[PDB]
Amino acid sequence: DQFTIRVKKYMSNPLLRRKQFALEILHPNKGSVAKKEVKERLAKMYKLNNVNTIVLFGFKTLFGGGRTKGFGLIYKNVDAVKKFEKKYRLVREGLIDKETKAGRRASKELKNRRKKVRGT
C-alpha cells in the first residue's frame, strides 16, 4: 500500500484514442505490486470511472527491489481498446478470449488443398 507511481514521458495521442506513458512504481521496502492495484491507482489519479481502459505492460522490477518500471496505455473508452489493441493484450486484460487451436497443422491442412471443391 505504500507505493507511489510516478508517470513519465506521458503522451496524449488522439491519432489512436490513448494516453501513453512510462510508469515507475516506487515501493520502497515492501517489494512488488500487482497490476490490479496499479490500475486502480491510475484510475484514482485520472478520475477515470472504469478501470479497464487501462492497459499496463512491460513491468520490469529492477535490481534490488524498491523501484519497478513499466508502460502504461490508457484508452478513451473500451470500444477504442477493442478497436486498436492487439488481441493478445486484450486477452491478457480479460476483455475477450478465443482459445482457438488453429495451430500450425493449419499450414499442413492448407497445403493438403490440391484440387478444391472441398469442404473436405
Binding site: 517489494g31 535490481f63 534490488g64 523501484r67
Partner: protein, 185 residues
Amino acid sequence: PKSYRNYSKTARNPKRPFEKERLDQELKLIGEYGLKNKREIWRVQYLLAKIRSAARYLLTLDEKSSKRIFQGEALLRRMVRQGLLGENEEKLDYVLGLTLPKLLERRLQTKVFKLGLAKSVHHARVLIRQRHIRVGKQMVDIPSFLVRVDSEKHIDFATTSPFGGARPGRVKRKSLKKQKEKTEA
C-alpha cells in the same frame, strides 16, 4: 543471421607468465584490495591502459588542435568524475601518472572498507555480494563497481538489509527467533 550484439575482451593476459617481481606485485595488490584473481588486476590494467594510450595519443598532438582540446578535455572530465584526479592534477600529462592503486581505490569494496561499514576488505566484499550496500537508491552486488565522486557520499547499507533496517530477515536470525518462541511456548 548472426546477432549484432557486439562483445569485447575486457582483460589482456601478461606476456611473460612467470616473471617473479610482477607476480609479487600482483599478489600484493590482491592482498591490499581484496581481489579474487589476477584477472581482476588485469582487467583494471586494461581499463587504465586504454585511458593511458588515449592520453599519449593526445599528447602527440599539439594544443589548440581541435581533437586534442575536445577529446583530451573529455578524457580529463571522465577521469575527474571517476575520482582519479580531482582539483590539483587535471592537465592531461597527469592522467598518464595514474597507477593501479588509484583505480583500485575507487572500487566499491575499497570505498566500503574506507567509509567504516566493514572491519576488512574481504568483509566488505562479502557484504557487497550479500545484497547489502546501496549507492544512491540503487542496491549493488558487484564489488568491482567503480564509484564516481558524485556518488561516493551516497554509500551506505541498503534499505532492505538486516543491518539497514528491514527485519532480521535471514535464515539465521529469523530461525533463532523462531526457536526462542518455541522454547517460550
